Design a binder for this molecule. Sequence first.
Ligand SMILES: O=C(Nc1cc(Nc2ccc3c(c2)CCCCC3=O)ccc1F)c1ccccc1
Ligand SMILES: CCCCCCCCO[C@@H]1O[C@H](CO)[C@@H](O)[C@H](O)[C@H]1O
Ligand SMILES: CCCCCCCCO[C@@H]1O[C@H](CO)[C@@H](O)[C@H](O)[C@H]1O
Length: 334
Amino acid sequence: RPTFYRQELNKTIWEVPERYQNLSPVGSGSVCAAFDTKTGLRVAVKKLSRPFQSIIHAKRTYRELRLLKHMKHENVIGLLDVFTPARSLEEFNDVYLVTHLMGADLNNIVKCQKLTDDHVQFLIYQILRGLKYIHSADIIHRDLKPSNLAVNEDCELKILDFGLVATRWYRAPEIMLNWMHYNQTVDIWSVGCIMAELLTGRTLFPGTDHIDQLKLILRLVGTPGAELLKKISSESARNYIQSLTQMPKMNFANVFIGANPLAVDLLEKMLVLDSDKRITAAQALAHAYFAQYHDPDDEPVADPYDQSFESRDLLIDEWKSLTYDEVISFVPPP
Ligand SMILES: O=C(Nc1cc(Nc2ccc3c(c2)CCCCC3=O)ccc1F)c1ccccc1
Ligand SMILES: CCCCCCCCO[C@@H]1O[C@H](CO)[C@@H](O)[C@H](O)[C@H]1O
Ligand SMILES: CCCCCCCCO[C@@H]1O[C@H](CO)[C@@H](O)[C@H](O)[C@H]1O
C-alpha cells in the first residue's frame, strides 16, 4: 500500500500516493496535471466528485472506470493507476484516476492556422486508428472534438472522454436531433469536422445555437435526398427541414480550395448526412490519403467489452461494490 498525503486543490482535499508530485489543476470531478516520480511520466490525476452521491453518479463512476481499464491502445487514453485512500469497501468513498498527460489538446495546435497536409494526414490517421479500436469494442464516443484530442510535442495523439470554442460544432446532426438510436458513424462526422478545420484553420460549422448549426450543415451538405428522406418518419419534420431553402449539396470544393484532392475526397465520404452512407474508421484507414502511414497489420482492434451494465438500473451500493472490485483488481501496464 502506497503512502498517501493530503493537499488542498479545487475546493476539495486530495489524498494521493506520494509518487505523484506537482499537482496542478488543468480543468474542473476535476483534473490536475502531475509528475509521476515513479515512472518519470507526466500524468493527469482525476478525482471523481461525490462518485457515490446518487444512482446516476455511482453508474457514471463505474462506467468511466470500466472504459478506462479496457482501453489498451496507443491512440486512446488508458489507465496508468486507479487508487482510493479507503482501506475497505465501507470506508470507500473516493476514487482517483491516473492517465497520461500528453501535454496539449488539439485546440493548442489549430491556433487558427492551416496545418500542412502532411501534418493533417498524420493527425487524422491517428484519430481514425484510435476510433477503429474503440468502435471495434462497440463503444461510440458521441462527443469527439479537438478538446478531447490529447497531443504531445512529437504530435502523438490520444483520444479521451468517450462513454455511453463551442462544444456542439463537431456533433453529428442526428445526435443533436434526439434520434432514438446511433451508429458508430456519429464520430466520423466529428472527424470530418476536425479534419476540415485543420486544413482550413477555420471552424467548418460554427453554429450560434442549435437551429443555426443545423442550417449551416444543410447549406454545405445540402437537403436530404430521397434515400435519406425515406428514413425520416415525420411529414411535419420533412416539411420543416424543407422550409430551410431545400437546395442541393454544395460540391465540396469552395471550402477546401487548394487542398489535396485526396483529402477533399475523404471529407466528402465522412461528411454525409445519412449516417449509413459515411465511411467507417477501418475503411478510411485504407483510403489513399493515408498511404504514407497506413499499415494493415498495426491498426489493432479491441478485446470485446462487457457493457451489459449499461442497460441496468441498480441500487447505489451495487454500483459502489462493483466499482470497488474494479479498483482492487487493477494491474498497471508494465
Ligand atoms: O478521458 C476520460 N477521463 C479522463 C480524462 C482526463 N483528462 C485529461 C487528460 C489529459 C489531458 C487533458 C485532460 C486535457 C489537457 C491537456 C493535457 C492532457 O493530455 C484525465 C483523466 C481521466 F480519467 C474518460 C474516458 C472515458 C469515459 C469518461 C471519461
Ligand atoms: C437537419 C437534417 C439532419 C437529419 C439527417 C441526420 C441523418 C442521420 O442518418 C441516420 O441516422 C440513423 C442512426 O442514428 C439511421 O438509423 C439512419 O439510417 C440514418 O439515415
Ligand atoms: C431543425 C430541422 C428539423 C429536423 C427534423 C428531423 C427530426 C428527425 O426525427 C427523428 O426521426 C427518426 C426517424 O423518423 C426517429 O427515429 C426519431 O424518433 C426522431 O427523433
